Design an enzyme around this catalytic site. Structure first.
Site, short mmCIF file in Angstrom:
data_model
loop_
_atom_site.label_atom_id
_atom_site.label_comp_id
_atom_site.label_asym_id
_atom_site.label_seq_id
_atom_site.Cartn_x
_atom_site.Cartn_y
_atom_site.Cartn_z
N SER A 62 0.79 -1.25 0.00
CA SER A 62 0.00 0.00 0.00
C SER A 62 0.81 1.29 0.00
CB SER A 62 -1.01 0.01 1.16
OG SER A 62 -2.01 -0.98 0.95
N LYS A 65 0.42 3.51 -2.96
CA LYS A 65 -0.58 4.59 -3.07
C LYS A 65 0.05 5.97 -3.08
CE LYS A 65 -4.42 2.00 -0.98
NZ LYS A 65 -3.75 0.67 -0.85
N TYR A 149 -11.02 2.66 4.40
CA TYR A 149 -9.81 2.40 3.63
C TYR A 149 -10.10 1.39 2.51
CZ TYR A 149 -4.82 1.64 2.70
OH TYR A 149 -3.57 1.54 2.13
N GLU A 271 -0.51 9.93 5.02
CA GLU A 271 -1.31 10.20 6.22
C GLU A 271 -0.42 10.90 7.25
OE1 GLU A 271 -3.07 6.45 7.38
OE2 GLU A 271 -3.53 5.93 5.28
N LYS A 314 3.15 6.11 5.64
CA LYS A 314 2.29 5.14 5.00
C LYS A 314 2.84 3.75 5.30
CE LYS A 314 -1.33 3.92 2.76
NZ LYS A 314 -1.44 2.70 3.61
N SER A 317 1.58 -3.60 2.99
CA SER A 317 1.81 -5.04 3.13
C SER A 317 1.40 -5.78 1.88
CB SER A 317 0.99 -5.61 4.31
OG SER A 317 1.33 -4.97 5.52
C1 LIG Z 1 -1.80 -2.22 1.52
O1 LIG Z 1 -0.66 -2.60 1.82
N1 LIG Z 1 -2.89 -3.04 1.44
C2 LIG Z 1 -4.24 -2.49 1.54
C3 LIG Z 1 -4.65 -2.54 2.99
N2 LIG Z 1 -3.65 -1.71 3.66
O2 LIG Z 1 -3.98 -1.54 5.05
S1 LIG Z 1 -2.57 -1.35 5.89
O3 LIG Z 1 -2.89 -0.74 7.17
O4 LIG Z 1 -1.88 -2.63 5.82
O5 LIG Z 1 -1.69 -0.33 4.98
C4 LIG Z 1 -4.64 -3.99 3.46
C5 LIG Z 1 -3.35 -4.74 3.17
C6 LIG Z 1 -2.67 -4.43 1.84
C7 LIG Z 1 -3.21 -5.26 0.69
O6 LIG Z 1 -3.89 -4.79 -0.22
N3 LIG Z 1 -2.82 -6.58 0.74
C8 LIG Z 1 -3.23 -7.52 -0.29
C9 LIG Z 1 -3.15 -8.95 0.18
C10 LIG Z 1 -3.66 -9.89 -0.91
N4 LIG Z 1 -2.89 -9.70 -2.13
C11 LIG Z 1 -3.02 -8.32 -2.59
C12 LIG Z 1 -2.42 -7.38 -1.56
#
Ligand SMILES: *C(=O)N1C[C@H](NOS(=O)(=O)O)CC[C@H]1C(=O)NC1CCNCC1
Length: 361
Positions: A62, A65, A149, A271, A314, A317
């Protein structure tokens, strides 16, 4: 004494957390007083024994972004879009849908009205499936009222910024954005020639994990980069005036806050928090309920400059990786922490906070 002290401080911050979270490999980069400092720990691959270096490619999830925001910031400067545009202005396929009533800013800042964390598993990396997903979606609540989010939200924002520029998002990042930022170790699609640099990711039972294709992956979570390149990106954020005007202005656009949820001020990608603030508050800002639950926003009377005594950050993961980036504009200080295990955000923030507080002491 200074190099010894910095090494001592970074080791003391990183090593316990690395060990406690069984992180195979971890790269730190710090920008301090206009100079980069790199600290590399452990293994990029446990199986072949490749060690982490400042050139090792990690998935940043993320954190992507913030690059997506920078592209959008560019489109804003090219007078190709405005934050108050209706989303459907930039994709005819969306005309007549609920995206007639939703702004680019709503999308960018997760307030479109309950777009979910991820696209449903049924939505593949397919333009028609993506188009049809948005066409059928209905808000749970009024746009501009609640932050939830969302990859689909900012993903659409990035996609429409690319449309406004008349080129694919991925092509724009590779051909324009990454080169403009001087980033030669930053990829959406790692070249075959660079695969030897790409760390293995590790999950439960140390199963190997790298990110696979998904709808709007590039926009939401798809960037792979090195600690050295991500720090170059941080230094660009610290000193936008060092780039040519169009790209300076693009970066500036990601340093503007639109509303607050608790201690956090939401910009484009970035953020922000007041600085100093307690470790526990910074951890709470990056906690699971902030990512997974809706929060009513407190809208600012006008966009707020995210500069001076503030910490901009930011988390990011993937299944196999855990990244964190933080910088303090008013102190010309930045840091990057990249790991090849997805370990809790609170732990990443703990490492960062230990480094920052040791630097001020
Ligand atoms: C970002 O890293 N993302 C979106 C969302 N972020 O929340 S955070 O607090 O970890 O930054 C959830 C985790 C992550 C995401 O999209 N992870 C996916 C896991 C499944 N494969 C696609 C990536």
């Amino acid at each position: 004494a200074p190099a010894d002290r910095l090494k001592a401080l970074v080791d003391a911050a990183v090593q316990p957390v690395m060990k406690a979270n069984d992180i195979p490999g971890l790269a730190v980069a710090i920008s301090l007083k206009g100079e980069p400092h790199y600290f590399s720990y452990g293994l990029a691959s446990k199986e072949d024994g490749r060690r982490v270096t400042p050139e090792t490619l990690f998935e940043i999830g993320s954190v992507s972004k913030t690059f997506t925001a920078t592209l959008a910031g560019y489109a804003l400067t090219q007078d190709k879009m405005r934050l108050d545009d209706r989303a459907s202005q930039h994709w005819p396929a969306l005309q007549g849908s609920r995206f007639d009533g939703i702004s680019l800013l709503d999308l960018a800042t997760y307030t479109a009205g309950g777009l979910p964390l991820q696209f449903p598993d049924s939505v593949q990396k397919d333009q028609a499936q993506i188009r049809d997903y948005y066409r059928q979606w209905q808000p749970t609540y009024a746009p501009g009222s609640q932050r939830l989010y969302s990859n689909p939200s900012i993903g659409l924002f990035g996609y429409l910024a690319a449309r406004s520029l008349g080129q694919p998002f991925e092509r724009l990042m590779e051909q324009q954005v990454f080169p403009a930022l001087g980033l030669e170790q930053t990829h959406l699609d790692v070249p075959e020639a660079a695969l030897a640099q790409y760390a293995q990711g590790y999950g439960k039972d140390d199963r190997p994990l790298r990110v696979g294709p998904g709808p709007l992956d590039a926009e939401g979570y798809g960037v792979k980069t090195s600690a050295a390149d991500l720090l170059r990106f941080v230094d660009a954020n610290l000193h936008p005036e060092r780039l040519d005007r169009p790209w300076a202005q693009a970066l500036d656009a990601t340093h503007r806050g639109y509303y607050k949820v608790g201690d956090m001020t939401q910009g484009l990608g970035w953020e922000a928090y007041d600085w100093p603030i307690s470790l526990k508050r910074l951890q709470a800002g990056n906690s699971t309920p902030m990512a997974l639950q809706p929060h009513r926003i407190a809208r600012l009377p006008a966009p707020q400059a995210l500069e001076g005594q503030r910490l901009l950050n930011k988390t990011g993961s993937t299944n196999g990786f855990g990244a964190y980036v933080a910088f303090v504009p008013g102190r010309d200080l930045g840091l990057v922490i990249l790991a090849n295990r997805n370990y809790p955000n609170a732990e990443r923030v703990k490492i960062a906070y230990a480094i920052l507080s040791g630097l001020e002491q």
